[PDB]
Amino acid sequence: DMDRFIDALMKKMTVEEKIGQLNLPVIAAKIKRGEVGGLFNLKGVEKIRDVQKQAVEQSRLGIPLLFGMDVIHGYETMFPIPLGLSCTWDMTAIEESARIAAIEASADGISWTFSPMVDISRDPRWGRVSEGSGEDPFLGAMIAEAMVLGYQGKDMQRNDEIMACVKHFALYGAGEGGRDYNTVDMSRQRMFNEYMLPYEAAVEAGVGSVMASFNEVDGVPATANKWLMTDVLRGQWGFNGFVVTNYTGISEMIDHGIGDLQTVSARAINAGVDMDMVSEGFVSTLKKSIQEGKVSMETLNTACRRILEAKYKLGLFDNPYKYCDLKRPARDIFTKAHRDAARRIAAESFVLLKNDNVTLRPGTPAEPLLPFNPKGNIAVIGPLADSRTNMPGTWSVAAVLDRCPSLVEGLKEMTAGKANILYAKGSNLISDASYEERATMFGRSLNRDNRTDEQLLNEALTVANQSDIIIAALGESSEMSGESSSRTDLNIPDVQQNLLKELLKTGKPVVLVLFTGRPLTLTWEQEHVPAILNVWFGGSEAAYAIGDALFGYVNPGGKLTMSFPKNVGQIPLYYAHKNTGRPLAQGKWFEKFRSNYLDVDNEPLYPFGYGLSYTTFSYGDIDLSRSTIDMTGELTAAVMVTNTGTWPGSEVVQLYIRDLVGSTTRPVKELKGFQKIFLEPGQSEIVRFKIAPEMLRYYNYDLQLVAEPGEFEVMIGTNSRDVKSARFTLK
Amino acid sequence: DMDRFIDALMKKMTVEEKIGQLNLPVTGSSDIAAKIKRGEVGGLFNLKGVEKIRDVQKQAVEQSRLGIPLLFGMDVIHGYETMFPIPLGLSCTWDMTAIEESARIAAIEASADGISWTFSPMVDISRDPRWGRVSEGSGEDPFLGAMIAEAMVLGYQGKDMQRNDEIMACVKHFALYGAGEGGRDYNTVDMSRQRMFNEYMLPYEAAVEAGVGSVMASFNEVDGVPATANKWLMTDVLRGQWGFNGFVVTNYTGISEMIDHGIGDLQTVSARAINAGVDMDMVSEGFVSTLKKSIQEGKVSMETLNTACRRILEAKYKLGLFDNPYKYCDLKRPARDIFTKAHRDAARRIAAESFVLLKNDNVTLRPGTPAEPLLPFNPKGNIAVIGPLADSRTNMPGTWSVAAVLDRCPSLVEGLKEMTAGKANILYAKGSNLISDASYEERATMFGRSLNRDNRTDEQLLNEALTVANQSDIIIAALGESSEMSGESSSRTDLNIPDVQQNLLKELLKTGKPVVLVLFTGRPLTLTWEQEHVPAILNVWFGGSEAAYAIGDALFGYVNPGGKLTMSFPKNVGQIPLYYAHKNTGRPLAQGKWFEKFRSNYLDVDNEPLYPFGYGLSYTTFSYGDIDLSRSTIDMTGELTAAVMVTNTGTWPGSEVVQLYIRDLVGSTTRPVKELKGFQKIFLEPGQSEIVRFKIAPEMLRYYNYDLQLVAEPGEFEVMIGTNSRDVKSARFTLKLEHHHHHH
Numbered sequence A: 001d002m003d004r005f006i007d008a009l010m011k012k013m014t015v016e017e018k019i020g021q022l023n024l025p026v027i028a029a030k031i032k033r034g035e036v037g038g039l040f041n042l043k044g045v046e047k048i049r050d051v052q053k054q055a056v057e058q059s060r061l062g063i064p065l066l067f068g069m070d071v072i073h074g075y076e077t078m079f080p081i082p083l084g085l086s087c088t089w090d091m092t093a094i095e096e097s098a099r100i101a102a103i104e105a106s107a108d109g110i111s112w113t114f115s116p117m118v119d120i121s122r123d124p125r126w127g128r129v130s131e132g133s134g135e136d137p138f139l140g141a142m143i144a145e146a147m148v149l150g151y152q153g154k155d156m157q158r159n160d161e162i163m164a165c166v167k168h169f170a171l172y173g174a175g176e177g178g179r180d181y182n183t184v185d186m187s188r189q190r191m192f193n194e195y196m197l198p199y200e201a202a203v204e205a206g207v208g209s210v211m212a213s214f215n216e217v218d219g220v221p222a223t224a225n226k227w228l229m230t231d232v233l234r235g236q237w238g239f240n241g242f243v244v245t246n247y248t249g250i251s252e253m254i255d256h257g258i259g260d261l262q263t264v265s266a267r268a269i270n271a272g273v274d275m276d277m278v279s280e281g282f283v284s285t286l287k288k289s290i291q292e293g294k295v296s297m298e299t300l301n302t303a304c305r306r307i308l309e310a311k312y313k314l315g316l317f318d319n320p321y322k323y324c325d326l327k328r329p330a331r332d333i334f335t336k337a338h339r340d341a342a343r344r345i346a347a348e349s350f351v352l353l354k355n356d357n358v359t360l361r362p363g364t365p366a367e368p369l370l371p372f373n374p375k376g377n378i379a380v381i382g383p384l385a386d387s388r389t390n391m392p393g394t395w396s397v398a399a400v401l402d403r404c405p406s407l408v409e410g411l412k413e414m415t416a417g418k419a420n421i422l423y424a425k426g427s428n429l430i431s432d433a434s435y436e437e438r439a440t441m442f443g444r445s446l447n448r449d450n451r452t453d454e455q456l457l458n459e460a461l462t463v464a465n466q467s468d469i470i471i472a473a474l475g476e477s478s479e480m481s482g483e484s485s486s487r488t489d490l491n492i493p494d495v496q497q498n499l500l501k502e503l504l505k506t507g508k509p510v511v512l513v514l515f516t517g518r519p520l521t522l523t524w525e526q527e528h529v530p531a532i533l534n535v536w537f538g539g540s541e542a543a544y545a546i547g548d549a550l551f552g553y554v555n556p557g558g559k560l561t562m563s564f565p566k567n568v569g570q571i572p573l574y575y576a577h578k579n580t581g582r583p584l585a586q587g588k589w590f591e592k593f594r595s596n597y598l599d600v601d602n603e604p605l606y607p608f609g610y611g612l613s614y615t616t617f618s619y620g621d622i623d624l625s626r627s628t629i630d631m632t633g634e635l636t637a638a639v640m641v642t643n644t645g646t647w648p649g650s651e652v653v654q655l656y657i658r659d660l661v662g663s664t665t666r667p668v669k670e671l672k673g674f675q676k677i678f679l680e681p682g683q684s685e686i687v688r689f690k691i692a693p694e695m696l697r698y699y700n701y702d703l704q705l706v707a708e709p710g711e712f713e714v715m716i717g718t719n720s721r722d723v724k725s726a727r728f729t730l731k
Numbered sequence B: 001d002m003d004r005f006i007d008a009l010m011k012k013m014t015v016e017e018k019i020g021q022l023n024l025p026v027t028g029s030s031d032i033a034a035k036i037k038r039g040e041v042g043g044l045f046n047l048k049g050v051e052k053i054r055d056v057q058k059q060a061v062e063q064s065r066l067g068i069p070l071l072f073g074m075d076v077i078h079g080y081e082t083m084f085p086i087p088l089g090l091s092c093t094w095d096m097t098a099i100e101e102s103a104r105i106a107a108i109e110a111s112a113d114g115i116s117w118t119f120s121p122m123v124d125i126s127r128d129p130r131w132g133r134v135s136e137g138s139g140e141d142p143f144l145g146a147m148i149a150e151a152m153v154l155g156y157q158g159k160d161m162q163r164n165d166e167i168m169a170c171v172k173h174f175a176l177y178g179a180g181e182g183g184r185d186y187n188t189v190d191m192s193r194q195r196m197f198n199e200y201m202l203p204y205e206a207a208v209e210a211g212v213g214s215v216m217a218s219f220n221e222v223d224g225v226p227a228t229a230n231k232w233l234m235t236d237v238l239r240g241q242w243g244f245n246g247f248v249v250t251n252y253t254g255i256s257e258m259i260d261h262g263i264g265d266l267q268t269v270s271a272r273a274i275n276a277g278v279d280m281d282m283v284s285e286g287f288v289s290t291l292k293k294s295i296q297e298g299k300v301s302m303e304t305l306n307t308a309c310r311r312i313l314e315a316k317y318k319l320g321l322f323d324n325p326y327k328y329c330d331l332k333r334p335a336r337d338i339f340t341k342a343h344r345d346a347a348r349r350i351a352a353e354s355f356v357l358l359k360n361d362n363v364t365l366r367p368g369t370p371a372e373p374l375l376p377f378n379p380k381g382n383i384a385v386i387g388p389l390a391d392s393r394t395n396m397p398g399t400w401s402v403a404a405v406l407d408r409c410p411s412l413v414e415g416l417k418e419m420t421a422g423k424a425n426i427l428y429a430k431g432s433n434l435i436s437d438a439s440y441e442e443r444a445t446m447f448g449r450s451l452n453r454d455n456r457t458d459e460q461l462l463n464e465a466l467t468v469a470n471q472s473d474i475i476i477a478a479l480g481e482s483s484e485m486s487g488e489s490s491s492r493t494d495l496n497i498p499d500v501q502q503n504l505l506k507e508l509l510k511t512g513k514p515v516v517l518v519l520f521t522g523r524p525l526t527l528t529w530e531q532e533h534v535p536a537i538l539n540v541w542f543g544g545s546e547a548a549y550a551i552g553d554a555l556f557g558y559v560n561p562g563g564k565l566t567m568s569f570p571k572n573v574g575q576i577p578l579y580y581a582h583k584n585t586g587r588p589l590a591q592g593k594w595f596e597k598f599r600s601n602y603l604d605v606d607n608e609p610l611y612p613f614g615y616g617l618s619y620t621t622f623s624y625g626d627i628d629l630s631r632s633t634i635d636m637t638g639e640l641t642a643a644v645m646v647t648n649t650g651t652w653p654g655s656e657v658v659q660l661y662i663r664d665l666v667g668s669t670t671r672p673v674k675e676l677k678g679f680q681k682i683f684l685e686p687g688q689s690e691i692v693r694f695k696i697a698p699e700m701l702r703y704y705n706y707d708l709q710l711v712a713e714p715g716e717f718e719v720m721i722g723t724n725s726r727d728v729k730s731a732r733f734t735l736k737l738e739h740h741h742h743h744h
């Protein structure tokens, strides 16, 4: 067993060698000296194999390395960005996506992924919303579990199973002004009821590692916050793994303003941080700290032990080359089967935001633009229409970017012999040339040249007037989201929005195919564009999936996991909000002396859980099996859902709960369950949810996790706004 | 003795009479005469007129069983009839003496008219210019906000409220109400205890410390409990930590609003309120309708009721109302104390002192002559005054002027007419409506602030303004908010000058005539376009009843503007919240390096406000020498002096607000990059110099640490002094636990 092995190995180690197990730098000489615990961001089974060989056969103790990478939403086969993927509301698909990525990365030498990112955010200004699963902690927790299980399986024993890392612990999504890395501040009540569940869920699914976040919490950088890293993570949740810092998280504490390198390094290890990504604070200062009594041997041994336990659990003491099969890349990476899975999952992620009836032939009843049969002349216009490198999305560091088909390319393939695909760039990404450059960093250039916006527009209107339909491929470049990609405006960029206006003015039918990493402020578009399909960033096979949606091969079923506000002045806007002492009643905007603004109502443009289909769904009244239950009972909430339209398709039936009265104020609703059903036209299904006191608990004023007696409102519907309702009492 | 008298009085009262002292209906609430007869009423508010107040007091004294006199409340916020600037504007004076004076005058007038209690000062810290109630406070900063709280309470109450022109003040809104989410009024507040004490609480404390007689509970939740039911707030902090000896009143229907908050029925929330330390029920009738049943049922004890009742009675005793219930009911005072020339003269001085000159660039008026700033200018020729704020009397006082005679204030045109008669012709055009949307204009101009928007087209209004402008030598563009675009329940998600006014502005600028933007506002606005295109921008906030004359004083150079901002002006609403006393983060963007990938910064704008905290210009300029510290190392027992030479390097005499900032460089918790720790407002003639000195003592360097202990920690500090929070000179010093006791 493990304990004996690790005792024995640790009894042989110098203080230096124990310290070295905590170092995760950016080298061959470092490894020879036992100064390296793992490496990260190295791609290639050949390279990784040789570096491992150096560790195993050229270091004193032969201790093998962890190899980390950001395998976020795929290795080479790119699934949608996680925010888009969350919109599937399909935990099976989500697990599959993480399984596939793990198969691919492990085939290439990777034993550790810095995934899943589970940070709750209600601030769409923050670029890293693209990497999470929205604003809701329940959905977030379900997804966390599915991702950890996809990567790790049961116990990481297989050679296609890798170690996961829940990030970023904790509260990183609440950075002030939506500005990446900025100050976080909240009450402990808010932490537990509104932000912490996804981290806890990952821990409880047996995630092997946790990454400390960049932000402060209660005035202490997370990386030096013992309350977080010991009392909560270990003390409350029982985490038995190790904590890794984020990139230079230790030395950044110097800038935060809590001390010099040695001081903040000691505080981090004493807080419960075990591995030091890049900063070399542990390597360069811990021995001195140990000599001065600032860090005990016991603390060092604990951190070292954790690191070694992770390597044992990965099977790296049994076989250091477990993940270095030179034969596997050809078999496992970027296969047709994987790419087909990604295409399917991509089409499942898209959210149909709008699809109004339009006068398409004179005299006929108006009908929607989507789906349509690929015939005639299909214009595909905009700066996202013919970009390969912008399809996979941010955080695709192992992808071959210029290998993904552009939207034009993919649609051309899919329509060969049936229709003509007419392309026009239409506009730049944005008017400001310097913004376009930083927005298209990391190889996402759109090849901006000297053609002016006016020239670009004029070409596009020429093409548009030769067309039977216009697909406007607009929105963000993929690096307008991700890290250090915060925005103060959330519009479709200026020149693109002008292009869209002008395309609408041709009189031809226009479908907005919207690429984004975040919620955008779309009131103008919701008013004037007949059809809007949010395609997020669908992955390496996005172009094909977009075709599947457009041509009706897939009926869109995605639902939003994050509120789309009307303007930036409404931030933060989220569905699970408190009622206030002065709630504005429905339809009463504007009312003086209620909680409301002078210039806009309180509502998002599109609420949490919103998503349309090519069919329609109708809900009966909710049947509750009990009107009362006690603290040990249960009941069933049933509703019949009928496909009332003409298309087969899926519906995410959503369960919300309102605790009507509380000893503290309680949100107007909370997501507490969901089921994704598929129905043929005319077919019905009775959807049943179990409700029990376990589900009705929350963290009260004293942070006690408790369900209080009183009345509850159970709400079931097609989104967080449009619901059927009923009540019961807890005794 | 007060204790004897109140014991004796409380020994006579029934449970219904004790409960009745806790009840505060609104009049000016049903069946008030009969409720007073029954002893069911402890106070009233919103009744104006010393005649009416005396009648009702006589009812209480002569026709209730026990004759217990009433408190009479009103929102005396920035004046009774003589209106001073709105408090946010007033705060830009950086002048505590003037602030105290404004409060003294308002107390003199209010008390003349029967009023014994003002629901002032509002001291809520806010970093969010969306929130309309920023107009009512004194900006983002706790140091300045604390000093203002003190000055206001002292102004209203004096030493001990003994005089018949001193009234009881009420610090509001306890607590954290300025952090409402989305800047939407009444919305959820949430923050750490550390943030509360370091960043929000001090001005409430400074009001308690100044002897404020009462505190008003806020509308917001704190830690998921409505403030009105938050025992931690109303007992543990207010009494347990600060030793507040007064009483707590709810805000309007605060108790019954807890039903909507979602913590129970009227009886439950009323019981929880009184048990929390709330002493008086504004309007809800929660206390009067449910407290006896609660006492029967054991939900509230007789000791809790007695404690609340006693606080109300002690307030009345401390105000001198048992001694003379008609102390403030002198029917002859109104004719000699209210809206007097002496009061109005002070209001005009204080108003001119509140204005903030945001921009005043050189303009070439005529070829061959060197360019000069538009401000100030001698009144000559043809002066156009154009805009929806140009000829509105009723919008001059500002929001929260509930006792003012709105349509007696001169409009800006009228004011400029009087001041320039015989010297210049004032030409006038409306130019635009307040905003394109009529329904918005309506809600924006409620409470008697109509601009009398008519059925003219935007074209009619604009063309009339252009005919004026093209005949004029200078254009005074009177634009911005109506007064009721700020105040309570006036939150905005856009902070621009409204659409049709900004179009008007553009068109006036296109004439080529020189334009001065005289900006009326209750809040920070997003003014990047205006800062780029308008030569001169004078922020006049809302100046009060004498605003028009004060504006003339500034434009013509009778007063040199010396206001400084107390709240950050963002470049856009997507930067909110933006405040000077922020943390460094782990990845600070170095100055001048926007944009840099992997630093804390946005893709589309830099991190900076358009105008920072403490920003403001003058008709002259001031230069700062380097800082001289009297010593470089002290210990906890010591002190040092920071000194800077400030010189008037321009051609005009003028006042400068010299501002002291301190940065605690390293902490056990992260510390802000600076915090205001002092200021001095100096007046300098052209060429003149003055050495400004600040005492720095370890007690000023204290903050609430992780464990909420108010401590100073040894380490390095940076002393910064300058003309605003951005443009500062620097010097460093070290604090130790133990240093030299003598020179050796």
Ligand SMILES: OC[C@H]1O[C@@H](O[C@@H]2[C@@H](O)[C@H](O)[C@@H](CO)O[C@H]2O)[C@H](O)[C@@H](O)[C@@H]1O
Binding pocket: A593, B045, B074, B075, B119, B172, B251, B252, B488
């Ligand atoms: O005048 C007492 C307090 O009144 C509050 O303003 C109320 C408002 O909350 C209520 O909706 C309307 C209903 O007509 O009456 C106003 O007076 C203010 O929040 C307090 O600052 C003020 O002291």
Ligand SMILES: OC[C@H]1O[C@@H](O[C@@H]2[C@@H](O)[C@H](O)[C@@H](CO)O[C@H]2O)[C@H](O)[C@@H](O)[C@@H]1O
Binding pocket: A040, A041, A069, A070, A114, A167, A246, A247, A483, B598
């Ligand atoms: O790849 C490991 C972790 O890296 C962080 O992103 C860093 C960024 O913080 C740093 O400035 C640049 C330096 O080029 O490298 C990136 O890797 C991410 O925040 C983590 O999520 C990631 O797991």
Ligand SMILES: OC[C@H]1O[C@H](O)[C@H](O)[C@@H](O)[C@@H]1O
Binding pocket: B391, B392, B393, B394, B395, B407, B411
């Ligand atoms: O239009 C001129 C004036 O008319 C009325 O006297 C209004 O009360 C006033 O606000 C306005 O300035």
Ligand SMILES: [Mg+2]
Binding pocket: A659, A660, A661, A662, A708, A709, A710, A711
């Ligand atoms: Mg309940």
Ligand SMILES: [Mg+2]
Binding pocket: B664, B665, B666, B667, B713, B714, B715, B716
């Ligand atoms: Mg320090």
